[PDB]
Structure 1
Amino acid sequence: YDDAKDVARKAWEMGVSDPRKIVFSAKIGLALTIVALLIFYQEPNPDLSRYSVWAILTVVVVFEFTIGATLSKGFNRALGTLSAGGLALGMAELSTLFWEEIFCTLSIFCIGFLATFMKLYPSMKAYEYGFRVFLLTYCYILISGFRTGQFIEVAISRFLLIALGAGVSLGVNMFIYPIWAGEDLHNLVVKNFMNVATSLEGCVNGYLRCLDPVYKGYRSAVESTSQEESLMSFAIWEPPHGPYKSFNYPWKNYVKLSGALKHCAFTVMALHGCILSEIQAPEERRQVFRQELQRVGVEGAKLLRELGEKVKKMEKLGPVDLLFEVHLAAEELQHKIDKKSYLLVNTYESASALSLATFASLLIEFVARLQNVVDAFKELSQKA
């Protein structure tokens, strides 16, 4: 019973935090019950209601979270289905022309074999639903057409059914509280700034706290380029929905600003590795560089926090001279290790000392990786 409390809590916790799941499930439920209500109350005549399941099963099979996703995946499945339709109907008139059972058997071996590879090819890894709905539509059309004499009228009826289902699908998805895929990416390029500034602050302050929240911080930023590169495929399909003024919005720098950041979060990786490493500097020697090591972590996060606030607001005003206090912090960090360098050099009696030299110069590097981002965001600030 206590475990079941969490399951209810899990739904509530993901619910109250993000009111985008409840609304999506409400939208799909509404679409399904509207199709069913239309079937039962407005089309009760059995003259032709069998195919009425096309109508409710197409709403279920083509309704997805983001307008871009629904629209592009509908386009790909429509190309697969219509290509199978044209090619299969050509093969169907042929396959009635005189040994047609054997010809129509080979005509499905060939399609299965050819479509399988282009499904399995490494490049076409996300265009897999298209190959499934093409291999699975060739087969259906071909069997039904070998069975029936004049298929094309029933094919016309099936298309208006899968246009009466998908019509309501797209309409309800786009008009009733839409969920775009453009601002699912503008709210993601600005999320990584927030969970990297803490990863920087976690790794600078976890190194010294003596006498994981960090591991979930920076691994989200790094593991998003495989995602933002998808949300860049979905983002091109939406209209200029609101602030995103014109068509051809540069959803190419949001994977470039998140590119220079994910490249700047490859020191915070090794910056964390120094605290997880089996060799690390002793407590008493870390706490001689306490100020400057904290000084970079303190100010270094403040900039990278408000670099996000320059994306969330997408402030068409400017990032003017951001890195002065991090440069000063890094410069006098190095000049601070110029005096107390004997704590870094003369087996293991010197392998542990010297890992304190490895953090100090994995943190100055992060200061240098931080000039690349501001330029990779200065292009995005102006032209976008």
Structure 2
Amino acid sequence: MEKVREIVREGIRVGNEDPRRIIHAFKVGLALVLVSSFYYYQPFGPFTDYFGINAMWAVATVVVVFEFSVGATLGKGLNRGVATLVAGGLGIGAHQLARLSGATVEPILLVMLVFVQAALSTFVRFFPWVKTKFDYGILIFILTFALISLSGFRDEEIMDLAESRLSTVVIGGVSCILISIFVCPVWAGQDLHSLLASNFDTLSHFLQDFGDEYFEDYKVVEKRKKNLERYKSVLDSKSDEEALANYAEWEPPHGQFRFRHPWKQYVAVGALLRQCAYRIDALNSYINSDFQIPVDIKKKLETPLRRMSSESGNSMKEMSISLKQMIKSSSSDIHVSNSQAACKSLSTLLKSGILNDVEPLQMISLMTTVSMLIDIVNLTEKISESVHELASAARFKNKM
């Protein structure tokens, strides 16, 4: 009874985190009902020959092929389709040759050709190009060749069997793709777009909050969560960006997104934000340490550090705003030039010799923080140029 309560509240939070998981769970069952009723009630005619010979394979296709995104099922469906076509042609050819050879060497020769192909294709599944794009196609290539060659049929039956396999894969895959595209779509390109703009938002949050909280019992643990967990969620999402980009390359043009859309540029901007998260991680550790400088030693540098941190935070905020609405923007340029002027003001402040009355270990912590902020300012200048190049590549609208 107790673990029943735990699993129903776990289901409650999994559904509450994204409700499109509930709609995807209904779309899978709808595709199963649609495919099974097509092969049972047989609408236009009582099809025979290869049409209604096998119908468990259509349900196998729909269960395997359906996926949460649109590019995920389109990738699985197109891989399964072309692999079944090619391996079906090679399977009919293998049965022709092995029948032509002999009558008792025929199971021997067929199992040797299956050994050779499997070995050949299992080695090709370690190539990096085939690994990132078409690994499932090579698996279905092995599978379909070994189904057709190692069956116990003959020169007509094999032909019917190959056609049946090809036709039931096409019907199951097309039913999956039409329900995926036309009911409630979950585009992976929109999820990559939203994940990028959310990452910009969390970094802007830390920069403004560092501009305040650098110069100050459960509230300490609350702000500990609010600082640490956000940029630590940025660092652990290299893989999510990689996966959504591989899916979003498969999708058709929808809405605002053009047919050609630069997803590799999205992963490049994600990598630059991860470098900013490295520097933000270093700052956080120093902030949370126990060895803290006396506060007025920071208060003699409190002006241009506040200006640098706040203006780079506003630059990240304006870039996230311009990516959420897909426009070309020029607010980030003004907020970047202000941080550049603040860095030059700090460089003229440091020659004034205001740090000649300070212990050098405090100077170690102080010059670490100044170096981290200068690095983050130059990094946000790079991300501003890169987001501008992404905004011209995707042909964002020119409204502003």
TM-score by length of 1: 0.85
Match among 126, 136, 142 for residue 135 of structure 1: 142
Query: AA paired with 1:19?
Result: P
Alignment CA distance shift 1:182-1:23 (3 Å): same
Query: AA paired with 1:79?
Result: V
Q: Indicate conservation of the 8 Å contact 1:111/1:135, yes or no.
A: yes
Question: For each residue in 1:212-268, what CA deviation from the matched residue of structure 2 results, as whole angstroms up to 9, or x when unmatched?
Answer: 544442344344454434433333333321112x42233343233334333433322
Q: Indicate conservation of the 8 Å contact 1:221/1:265, yes or no.
A: yes
The structure where helix makes up a greater share of residues is: 2
Aligned match of 2:313: 301
Match among 323, 326, 329 for residue 336 of structure 2: 323
Aligned match of 1:355: 365
Aligned match of 1:10: 10
Question: For each residue in 1:181-211, what CA deviation from the matched residue of structure 2 results, as whole angstroms up to 9, or x when unmatched?
Answer: 221221122121012223445666665559x
Counterparts of 2:81 and 2:227 in 1: how far apart (Å)?
Answer: 44
Query: AA paired with 1:63?
Result: F
Structure 2 stretches lacking a partner, 5+ long: 396-400
Structure 1 stretches lacking a partner, 5+ long: none
Aligned match of 2:171: 164
Once the two structures are TM-superposed, the CA of residue 290 in structure 1 deviates from its matched residue by 4.5
Question: For each residue in 1:245-295, what CA deviation from the matched residue of structure 2 results, as whole angstroms up to 9, or x when unmatched?
Answer: x42233343233334333433322333343467x85435466434554444
Aligned match of 1:83: 86
Q: Indicate conservation of the 8 Å contact 2:269/2:386, yes or no.
A: yes
Query: AA paired with 2:374?
Result: I
Match among 43, 51, 54 for residue 54 of structure 2: 51
Aligned match of 2:269: 257
Aligned match of 2:398: none
Paired-residue identity, %: 31
1:116 aligns with 2:122: yes
1:371 aligns with 2:385: no
Alignment CA distance shift 1:225-1:85 (3 Å): same
Query: AA paired with 2:327?
Result: E
Q: Indicate conservation of the 8 Å contact 1:67/1:173, yes or no.
A: yes
Once the two structures are TM-superposed, the CA of residue 143 in structure 1 deviates from its matched residue by 0.9
Alignment CA distance shift 1:205-1:316 (3 Å): closer
Higher mean displacement: 228-237 or 358-367: 228-237
Aligned match of 2:293: 282
Q: Indicate conservation of the 8 Å contact 1:119/1:128, yes or no.
A: yes
Aligned match of 1:381: 391
Aligned match of 2:159: 152
Which secondary structure does the structure 2 equivalent of 1:190 belong to? helix
Q: Indicate conservation of the 8 Å contact 2:248/2:263, yes or no.
A: yes
Match among 179, 183, 198 for residue 186 of structure 2: 179
Query: AA paired with 1:194?
Result: D
Once the two structures are TM-superposed, the CA of residue 311 in structure 1 deviates from its matched residue by 0.5
Query: AA paired with 1:12?
Result: I
Match among 185, 188, 193 for residue 195 of structure 2: 188
1:20-99 matches, within 5 Å, as 20-42=20-42, 51-97=54-100, 98=102, 99=105
Aligned match of 2:280: 268
Question: For each residue in 1:91-126, what CA deviation from the matched residue of structure 2 results, as whole angstroms up to 9, or x when unmatched?
Answer: 111122221222122112212211111113344333
Q: Indicate conservation of the 8 Å contact 1:264/1:366, yes or no.
A: yes
Q: Indicate conservation of the 8 Å contact 1:222/1:262, yes or no.
A: yes
Which secondary structure does the structure 2 equivalent of 1:342 belong to? coil
Counterparts of 1:353 and 1:14 in 2: how far apart (Å)?
Answer: 48
Once the two structures are TM-superposed, the CA of residue 168 in structure 1 deviates from its matched residue by 1.4
Once the two structures are TM-superposed, the CA of residue 4 in structure 1 deviates from its matched residue by 4.2
Alignment CA distance shift 1:58-1:293 (3 Å): same
Alignment CA distance shift 1:303-1:7 (3 Å): farther
Once the two structures are TM-superposed, the CA of residue 52 in structure 1 deviates from its matched residue by 1.6
Counterparts of 1:2 and 1:110 in 2: how far apart (Å)?
Answer: 55
Aligned match of 1:242: 255
Alignment CA distance shift 1:178-1:343 (3 Å): farther
Counterparts of 1:94 and 1:225 in 2: how far apart (Å)?
Answer: 49
Higher mean displacement: 253-262 or 57-66: 253-262
Query: AA paired with 2:315?
Result: L
Once the two structures are TM-superposed, the CA of residue 69 in structure 1 deviates from its matched residue by 1.9
Alignment CA distance shift 1:242-1:46 (3 Å): closer
Counterparts of 1:2 and 1:329 in 2: how far apart (Å)?
Answer: 59
Q: Indicate conservation of the 8 Å contact 2:81/2:170, yes or no.
A: no
Tell me how large the CA RMSD over aligned residues is. Answer: 3.1
Counterparts of 2:58 and 2:89 in 1: how far apart (Å)?
Answer: 22
Match among 311, 326, 332 for residue 314 of structure 1: 326
